[PDB]
C-alpha cells in the first residue's frame, strides 16, 4: 500500500526510496528463494521509478536509506544501475546451475563473472564486465577456449555448442552446410569482438594466446588484419611457440611492404619518413636458428633472408642519400 | 655507488628514455613498444601502477610536470602526436592530443612553474610548438616554423630568472636560444661549434650563480660547455669537455650540484664536475 500510494502521488523519489528500503529489509530477514525473488522485484521497481524522473527536472536527490551519520548517496542512476545488474546476473546464473545459484546469492561482481564464464553464458559476462568497468579479457579468453575445444572435439560437444549459440546472439543466418556448430561459434565471437571493442592490444593478444593453448594454424584474414595493425606483436607470439619459418615469412613480407609492395596490408603509410624495423626480433630469430644448427634447410633459408636484407639495406642507403640531397 | 632496488619493467623492447618525478616517488618509462609505463617505486618496491598505450609508433621522450598543476605527464612520439596524460583519482586518462606536426616529435620539456603550464615540442619537421594551458578552456598553440633547417632534436627551458627563454638544438649543427619578446618567440642567439648533428641540449638549473651554463652533446662526440657570465651580454663561450669516440646521446644536469651526466654509444655514463680552478674532471664511470 505504501508503495502504491507514493507512486500515485508521483513522488518518484519517495517510491524509489521505499522500494530500496523494502529490498534491504526483505533480504536481511527472509533468505528463502521466494523472499529473494521478492527483493529482486523490489529493486527493479525502485530503479524503474527513479528513472521516471521528469526530463525538465533531471535531478534526483536521493539519500542513503541508513534507517533500513545519515549519509546521502547521490547515485543518480549509475550506482543503483550497478546493483540491479548484479542482482540480474545472480538471477541468470541461478537458472543455469543450482549450486552456483546459491553462490551468486551471496557473492560479488568478480565472483559472478567467474561462474558465468565457467558455465558458458558469455554474453551476460560481457555485459557485467562493462557495467563495473571490468575489462573484457576474461570473456574473450573463455570464448577462445570454447573455439579451441571445438576445433578438435567430439560430436556431443558440437551439439551443446550449437545450443549455447542460441542463448547468445548470432547476427545473421548463413546457409553454408560445411560450417557446422564450431564455425557458428567462431562467428559469434568475432561479432562480439567487433561491437564491444576497447584497447586492441588486449583483445587480439588474449585471443591469440588462448588459441595457442596446444597449437593452431591461424587463418589468413586474421593474419592480414594483425599485420596491418601490430606486426611486432604478431612476431613475438611466433617466438613464444617457436614458429621460425612463419616468422621469417612475416619479416620478408614486412620488408616488401616497407619497399612499397603491398604496404596497405601492413599499415605502412609509405617524402620518406616511417621506417621502423624491429631489429631485436630479428636478433632473437637468428639466435634461435644458431643453436641446434642441424637442419640444412633452415640454414639455407637463413642465408637467403640475410642476403635479401642486405640488398634491402643498400637500397635504403641509396634512397637516403637521395632524399638528404633533395631536402638540402 | 650503492645499489638500491632493481626494477622489473616487464617490457618488450629497449627503453629509450626515463624520468623520475619531483619528489622521487614515481618513474615514467618509454619504450619502442608504443607504451608509456608508470612505476611507483616507494621504499624499495617496484609497482607498475599504469600502462598507457595511445601511440602508433615508438615513444622517444617522457616529461613530468610540476606538482602544483597535478600529476601531468607528457609523452612525445613518432606518430606526430603529443599526448598529455593526467591522473584523476588514481586513473590515467588522455586529456589532450596535439597532432599538429608533419614528422616525429622527438622531445618534450615543461617550463618552470613560475611561467605557467607551458610545454615545448621539438619535431623533425624543424618546428617547435608551445602549448599553453590557461586554466580555463583549451590549449593555445604557438608554432615556431622553420626553427631548424633539417630537424629539431631536443628542447630545454631556462631556469626562471621573468623572461621566458628556452634552448633548442637541431640537425643543422647549430644550437639556438629562443626568447619571448612582446608575446612572440624570437630567435635570440646562434651558437656555432659543432661539426655535426646536435643530439641533445640541456640548460643547467643554475643555483646561486650569476653565470648561465648550457651543455650540448653531438654526433661527432664533442661535448661543449656554453657559458655566459652576464645574461644581458648574451656572449656565450664554449668549452670542450671531452671528445668521445662514439656518438654522445643526451646530457643531464644534477639539480643540486650541477654534475653533468654524459652517455655515449659506448654504453657508459661518465660523470663530469667542474673544479674551482675551472677545468672539468671526470669523477666516475658508470657503465651499463
Amino acid at each position: 500500500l505504501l508503495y502504491a500510494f507514493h507512486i500515485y502521488r508521483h513522488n518518484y523519489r519517495k517510491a524509489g526510496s521505499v522500494m530500496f528500503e523494502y529490498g534491504m529489509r526483505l533480504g536481511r530477514e527472509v533468505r528463502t528463494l521466494r523472499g529473494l525473488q521478492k527483493q529482486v522485484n523490489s529493486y527493479l521497481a525502485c530503479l524503474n521509478c527513479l528513472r521516471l524522473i521528469r526530463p525538465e527536472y533531471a535531478w534526483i536527490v536521493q539519500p542513503v536509506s541508513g534507517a533500513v551519520s545519515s549519509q546521502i548517496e547521490i547515485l543518480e542512476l549509475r550506482d543503483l544501475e550497478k546493483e540491479y545488474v548484479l542482482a540480474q546476473t545472480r538471477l541468470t546464473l541461478a537458472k543455469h546451475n543450482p549450486s552456483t545459484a546459491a553462490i551468486a546469492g551471496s557473492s560479488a561482481a568478480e565472483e559472478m563473472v567467474a561462474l558465468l564464464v565457467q558455465a558458458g553464458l558469455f554474453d551476460t559476462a560481457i555485459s557485467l564486465c562493462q557495467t563495473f568497468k571490468l575489462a573484457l579479457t576474461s570473456v574473450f579468453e573463455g570464448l577462445a577456449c570454447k573455439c579451441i575445444r571445438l576445433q578438435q572435439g567430439g560430436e556431443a560437444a558440437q551439439a551443446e555448442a550449437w545450443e549455447w549459440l542460441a542463448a547468445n546472439q548470432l547476427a545473421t543466418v548463413i546457409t553454408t552446410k560445411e560450417s557446422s556448430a564450431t564455425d557458428e561459434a567462431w562467428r559469434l565471437m568475432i561479432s562480439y569482438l567487433d561491437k564491444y571493442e576497447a584497447k586492441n592490444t588486449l583483445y587480439h593478444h588474449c585471443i591469440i594466446n588462448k588459441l595457442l593453448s596446444h597449437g593452431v594454424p591461424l587463418p589468413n584474414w586474421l593474419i592480414n588484419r594483425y599485420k596491418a595493425m601490430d606486426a611486432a606483436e604478431l612476431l613475438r607470439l611466433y617466438l613464444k611457440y617457436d614458429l621460425l619459418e612463419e616468422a621469417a615469412e612475416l619479416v620478408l613480407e614486412y620488408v616488401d611492404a616497407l619497399l612499397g609492395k603491398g604496404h596497405q596490408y601492413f599499415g605502412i603509410q609509405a617524402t620518406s619518413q616511417l621506417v621502423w624495423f624491429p631489429y631485436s626480433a630479428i636478433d632473437h630469430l637468428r639466435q634461435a636458428l644458431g643453436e641446434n644448427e642441424s637442419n640444412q634447410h633452415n640454414q639455407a633459408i637463413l642465408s637467403k633472408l640475410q642476403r635479401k636484407m642486405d640488398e634491402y639495406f643498400q637500397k635504403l642507403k641509396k634512397a637516403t642519400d637521395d632524399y638528404k640531397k633533395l631536402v638540402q | 655507488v650503492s645499489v638500491i632496488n632493481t626494477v622489473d619493467t616487464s617490457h618488450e623492447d629497449m627503453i629509450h628514455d626515463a624520468q623520475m618525478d619531483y619528489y622521487g616517488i614515481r618513474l615514467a618509462t618509454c619504450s619502442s613498444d608504443r607504451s608509456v609505463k608508470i612505476f611507483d617505486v616507494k621504499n624499495g618496491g617496484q609497482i607498475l601502477i599504469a600502462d598507457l598505450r595511445g601511440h602508433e609508433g615508438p615513444v622517444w621522450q617522457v616529461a613530468w610536470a610540476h606538482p602544483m598543476y597535478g600529476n601531468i605527464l607528457a609523452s612525445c612520439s613518432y606518430d606526430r602526436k603529443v599526448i598529455i596524460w593526467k591522473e584523476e583519482n588514481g586513473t590515467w586518462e588522455k586529456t589532450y592530443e596535439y597532432t599538429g606536426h608533419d614528422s616525429s616529435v622527438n622531445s618534450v620539456c615543461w617550463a618552470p612553474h613560475d611561467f605557467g603550464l607551458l610545454l615545448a615540442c621539438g619535431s623533425s619537421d624543424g618546428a617547435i610548438s608551445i602549448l599553453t594551458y590557461t586554466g580555463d578552456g583549451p590549449w593555445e598553440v604557438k608554432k615556431i616554423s622553420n626553427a631548424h633547417t633539417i630537424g629539431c632534436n631536443a628542447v630545454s627551458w631556462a631556469p626562471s630568472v621573468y623572461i621566458k627563454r628556452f634552448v633548442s638544438g637541431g640537425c643543422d649543427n647549430l644550437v639556438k636560444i629562443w626568447r619571448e619578446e612582446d608575446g612572440q618567440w624570437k630567435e635570440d642567439q646562434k651558437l656555432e661549434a659543432h661539426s655535426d648533428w646536435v643530439r641533445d641540449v640541456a640548460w643547467a638549473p643554475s643555483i646561486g650563480l650569476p653565470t648561465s651554463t648550457i651543455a650540448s652533446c653531438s654526433q661527432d662526440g664533442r661535448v661543449y660547455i656554453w657559458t655566459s657570465d652576464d645574461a644581458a651580454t648574451n656572449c656565450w663561450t664554449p668549452k670542450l669537455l671531452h671528445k668521445f669516440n662514439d656518438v654522445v646521446w643526451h646530457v643531464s644536469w644534477s639539480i643540486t650540484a650541477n654534475i653533468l651526466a654524459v652517455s655515449g654509444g659506448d654504453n657508459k655514463v661518465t660523470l663530469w664536475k667542474e673544479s674551482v680552478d675551472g677545468q672539468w674532471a671526470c669523477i666516475s664511470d658508470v657503465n651499463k
Binding site: 635504403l316 638528404k324 | 629509450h16 628514455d17 622527438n106 646521446w249 646530457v251 643531464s252 652517455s263
Partner: peptide, 30 residues
C-alpha cells in the same frame, strides 16, 4: 637480451641521413 655486438651493417645504415634519428633510437640517457 640486447644483442651483444652487431656494429657494421647497422652502423653503415646508422650513418644514413634519411632517418639517422630512427636508426639512433637504441640510445638512452636519463
Amino acid at each position: 637480451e640486447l644483442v651483444p655486438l652487431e656494429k657494421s651493417v647497422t652502423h653503415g645504415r646508422g650513418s644514413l641521413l634519411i632517418d639517422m634519428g630512427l636508426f639512433m633510437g637504441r640510445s638512452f640517457r636519463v
